[PDB]
Amino acid sequence: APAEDGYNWRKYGQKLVKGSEYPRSYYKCTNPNCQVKKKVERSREGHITEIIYKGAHNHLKPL
DNA sequence: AGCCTTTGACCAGCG
DNA sequence: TCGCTGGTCAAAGGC
Ligand SMILES: [Zn+2]
């Protein structure tokens, strides 16, 4: 489960990418007409979670 | 009812 | 040309 960020997301895939221990998850912003997506993947070194966003939101943070 | 995660299949770029 | 592979599709099931 990914960290909260004030936006609403839907998970739409998960893949174990080469050179990673932990699988990577793919989410999309459920705002219709908004196509921001983000990737989420943990890593053991330093207990790290990288969240990578592609695209700027169409709209204010949901109510 | 509607929206979520899970999942293997599908996909397109490229070495 | 054709596999590998990171990214996406969508059916199935659960709440
Ligand atoms: Zn958005």
What HEC string does chain A produce?
A: CCCCCCCCEEEEEEECCCCCCCCEEEEEECCCCCCCEEEEEEECCCCEEEEEEECCCCCCCCC
Q: How far is the CA of A3 from the centre of ligand 1 (A)?
A: 16
Query: Which CATH number do you get for residue A4?
Result: 2.20.25.80
Question: Does the CB of A61 sit below 7 A from strand C?
Answer: no
Experimental method: X-ray
Buried-state track A8-36, b at ≥16 Cβ within 10 A, e below 16: ebeeeeeeeeeeeeeebbbbbbebeebeb
- Rounded to whole angstroms, the Cα distance separating A41 from A23 reads 6
- Check whether A57 is labelled as a binding-site residue: yes
> Resolution for this model in angstroms, one decimal place?
2.4
Listed as ranges, the nucleotides of chain C within 7 A of a protein C-beta are 5-10
Domain that holds residue A44: 1-63
- Check whether A29 is labelled as a binding-site residue: yes
Q: How many domains does chain A have?
A: 1
DSSP bridge partners of A28 = A10, A37
Q: Are A40 and A28 in contact (CB under 8 A)?
A: no
DSSP bridge partners of A15 = A24
Closest Cα partner for A19 from A58, A45, A53? A45
Question: Does the CB of A11 sit below 7 A from strand B?
Answer: yes
> In this structure, which long-range contacts are made by residues A15-21, counting pairs with CB atoms below 8 Å and at least 24 apart in sequence?
A17/A41
